[PDB]
Amino acid sequence: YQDVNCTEVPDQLTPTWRVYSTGSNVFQTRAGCLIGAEHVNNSYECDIPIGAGICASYQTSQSIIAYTMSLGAENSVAYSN
Amino acid sequence: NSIAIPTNFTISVTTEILPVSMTKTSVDCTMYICGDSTECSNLLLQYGSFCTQLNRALTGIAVEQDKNTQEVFAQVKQIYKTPPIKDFGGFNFSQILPDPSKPSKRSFIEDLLFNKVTDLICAQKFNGLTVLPPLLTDEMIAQYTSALLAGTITSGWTFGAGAALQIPFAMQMAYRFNGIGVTQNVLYENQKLIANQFNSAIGKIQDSLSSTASALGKLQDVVNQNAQALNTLVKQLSSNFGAISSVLNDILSRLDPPEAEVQIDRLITGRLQSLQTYVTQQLIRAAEIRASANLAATKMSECVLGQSKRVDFCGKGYHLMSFPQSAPHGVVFLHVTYVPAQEKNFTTAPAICHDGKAHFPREGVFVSNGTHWFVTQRNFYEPQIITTDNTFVSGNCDVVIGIVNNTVYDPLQPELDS
Amino acid sequence: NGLTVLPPLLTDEMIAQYTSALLAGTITSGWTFGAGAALQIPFAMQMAYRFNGIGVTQNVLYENQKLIANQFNSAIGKIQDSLSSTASALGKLQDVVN
Amino acid sequence: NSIAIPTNFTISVTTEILPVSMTKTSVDCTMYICGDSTECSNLLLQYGS
Amino acid sequence: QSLQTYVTQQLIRAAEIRASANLAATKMSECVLGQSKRVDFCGKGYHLM
Numbered sequence A: 001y002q003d004v005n006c007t008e009v010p011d012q013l014t015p016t017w018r019v020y021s022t023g024s025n026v027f028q029t030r031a032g033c034l035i036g037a038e039h040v041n042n043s044y045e046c047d048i049p050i051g052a053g054i055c056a057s058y059q060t061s062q063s064i065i066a067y068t069m070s071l072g073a074e075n076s077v078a079y080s081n
Numbered sequence B: 001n002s003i004a005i006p007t008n009f010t011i012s013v014t015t016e017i018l019p020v021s022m023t024k025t026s027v028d029c030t031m032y033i034c035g036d037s038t039e040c041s042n043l044l045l046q047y048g049s050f051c052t053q054l055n056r057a058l059t060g061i062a063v064e065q066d067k068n069t070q071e072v073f074a075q076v077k078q079i080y081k082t083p084p085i086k087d088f089g090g091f092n093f094s095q096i097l098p099d100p101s102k103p104s105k106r107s108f109i110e111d112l113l114f115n116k117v118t119d120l121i122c123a124q125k126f127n128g129l130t131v132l133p134p135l136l137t138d139e140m141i142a143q144y145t146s147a148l149l150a151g152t153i154t155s156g157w158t159f160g161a162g163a164a165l166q167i168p169f170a171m172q173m174a175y176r177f178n179g180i181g182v183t184q185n186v187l188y189e190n191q192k193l194i195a196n197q198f199n200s201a202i203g204k205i206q207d208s209l210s211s212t213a214s215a216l217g218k219l220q221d222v223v224n225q226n227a228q229a230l231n232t233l234v235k236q237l238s239s240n241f242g243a244i245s246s247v248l249n250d251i252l253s254r255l256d257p258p259e260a261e262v263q264i265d266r267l268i269t270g271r272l273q274s275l276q277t278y279v280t281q282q283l284i285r286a287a288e289i290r291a292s293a294n295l296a297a298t299k300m301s302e303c304v305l306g307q308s309k310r311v312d313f314c315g316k317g318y319h320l321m322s323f324p325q326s327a328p329h330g331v332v333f334l335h336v337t338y339v340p341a342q343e344k345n346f347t348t349a350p351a352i353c354h355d356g357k358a359h360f361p362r363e364g365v366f367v368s369n370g371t372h373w374f375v376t377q378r379n380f381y382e383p384q385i386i387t388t389d390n391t392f393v394s395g396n397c398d399v400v401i402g403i404v405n406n407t408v409y410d411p412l413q414p415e416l417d418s
Numbered sequence C: 001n002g003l004t005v006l007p008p009l010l011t012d013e014m015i016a017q018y019t020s021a022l023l024a025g026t027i028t029s030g031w032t033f034g035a036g037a038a039l040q041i042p043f044a045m046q047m048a049y050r051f052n053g054i055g056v057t058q059n060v061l062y063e064n065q066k067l068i069a070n071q072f073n074s075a076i077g078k079i080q081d082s083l084s085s086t087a088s089a090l091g092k093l094q095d096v097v098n
Numbered sequence D: 001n002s003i004a005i006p007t008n009f010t011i012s013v014t015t016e017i018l019p020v021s022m023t024k025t026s027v028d029c030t031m032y033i034c035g036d037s038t039e040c041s042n043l044l045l046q047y048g049s
Numbered sequence E: 001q002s003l004q005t006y007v008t009q010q011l012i013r014a015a016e017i018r019a020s021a022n023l024a025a026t027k028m029s030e031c032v033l034g035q036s037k038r039v040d041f042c043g044k045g046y047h048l049m
């Protein structure tokens, strides 16, 4: 639900969509309220771009996960003089 | 037979601002053409599939807008962090590397750009006009353009062509002089002056951006244009297009369907034309932005990830290096360039004749102070002695025009004598 | 019918004052007038610093100077006779107007 | 093990033509859509911007 | 509608001219204000001036 603070996702029009209007998977981003995805603490190069740095993809007995997209690995070149 | 050889240089920093993307808009065709009026939705339904074409176009646009920023910035396959060091041969990089003090990784020049580039928007929201946020936030851009700036400093032209290899900063600037003609001994004997000129140039740039009549007018022209076209798209809901009135509820509450329809249709044909015009303007302007975001990618790939030999491409003068900085919907380039100064007239000669055979320079020109003849590199006055080491003999001195009688000193014979 | 054609900001007599200052710098200064203060250099002695950029050494030029001059001049003459011919190659410019 | 080395050169002048600009046109919308007709100017006025 | 079509054609053709007037600027900046090493850019053959 784009640019909708999560409180407003109702009313109870059809329960098959009310399932996607509530639950524990309700997640908030800077692009709106995303429902039906699990918010993980990993980081990946992202497959389906939600927006504002959040991306979602399908994986593990599997489900849709919405993570924060990863730019890449770290490195620190040993710069001496 | 008169040449002019520079004797003192000047390292100058320019600036260049390039648009990269623009706001990702999206209009809800039904909600705009006739919104909240079920009595008009059916009428519009039969009018064709314009409602979905004018949403697929604005989706393609908002997708390439996300792709342009990937193209321009995401050119490093890793994320380098500059080591906590200051031993940059005297060069000062405070004004461009990210600071620890500020909570974000914004450098002292990237913030001068954010605080320089600058109801109705709610009304657009009520009319189905949405502005989506970009995929790459303004805190992730700063984590690329600070990994594109800690690789150039500590690795050079190598981090963009394989595994990054460290190299002392001084000893890489001297391998950038050696790419534009001036030999290395020029750098290693003028190191302090070069550092104290580069630092001053950076300071003057920082004071230049903060001035009024800002050169970043290119970046705030994009926003002005894309916020002016969309305001006309809302101004044009006040025109009735020759119908009874411009409010759809008025027409619905003054006329029965047999006569209401023949007026709604001269509304539905008036708003859809405006929407199509807006979509076409967006398509053309997005083509311009696409053109100008594949030149920024090229300048980032060449002026930054290496050194350029294309004249007047990476800033006026001989190009030494560059530094990228982020900016709202744009990229800023700080081309650091080498500029000669203080020319000085000299008398030259094509080729020199020692024993009838004509000696020629290997790298440089022949220059005389009026009495003695030397051979010098061409972008700096560094006279040497005309030896059989740096002149290659070729032919007989009767064919070249301008040959000068002189003497060439061989290093072998005098030292060998004992 | 309200269809107006405005005149350009730069007249066709000011264009000729740029493309004759872009052509008296190349001849007498070379690659330097576009990268700082222009520095003079004898014309021959700059063509030999343009041979030395494409591989051929300078002694090639300084020992073939007359032939090079008498070939460049002939090339210019043939170009002048080529433009004056029909089926002009400037069809790109008169396509815009058409 | 066979190479081919040129022995005599040829200096050639080409030509290249590039468009730079085009005629700067401008149309007066009212004067064209319905000109010299005050009875139509009002009608066109309400038609939008 | 005719006027809008004409304006759109002008916009597109002006985009073409803009594209072809930033290649002429590049060729003037490189082929003239220096020497080029890009093959078959400043005319066929090794480019002198």
Ligand SMILES: *[C@@H]1O[C@H](CO)[C@@H](O)[C@H](O)[C@H]1NC(C)=O
Pocket (backbone or CB within 6 Å): A005, A006, A007
């Ligand atoms: C969203 O709703 C919560 C719950 O009322 C509120 O605390 C928060 O301030 C709201 N934020 C926005 C951006 O509307």
Ligand SMILES: *[C@@H]1O[C@H](CO)[C@@H](O)[C@H](O)[C@H]1NC(C)=O
Pocket (backbone or CB within 6 Å): A040, A041
């Ligand atoms: C993920 O990070 C948030 C932010 O601190 C934290 O509250 C949460 O417990 C973390 N969850 C996991 C599974 O690491």
Ligand SMILES: *[C@@H]1O[C@H](CO)[C@@H](O)[C@H](O)[C@H]1NC(C)=O
Pocket (backbone or CB within 6 Å): B001, B401, B402
């Ligand atoms: C240069 O020009 C002067 C003009 O009098 C002439 O005397 C001299 O021989 C010329 N030298 C060369 C090398 O062209």
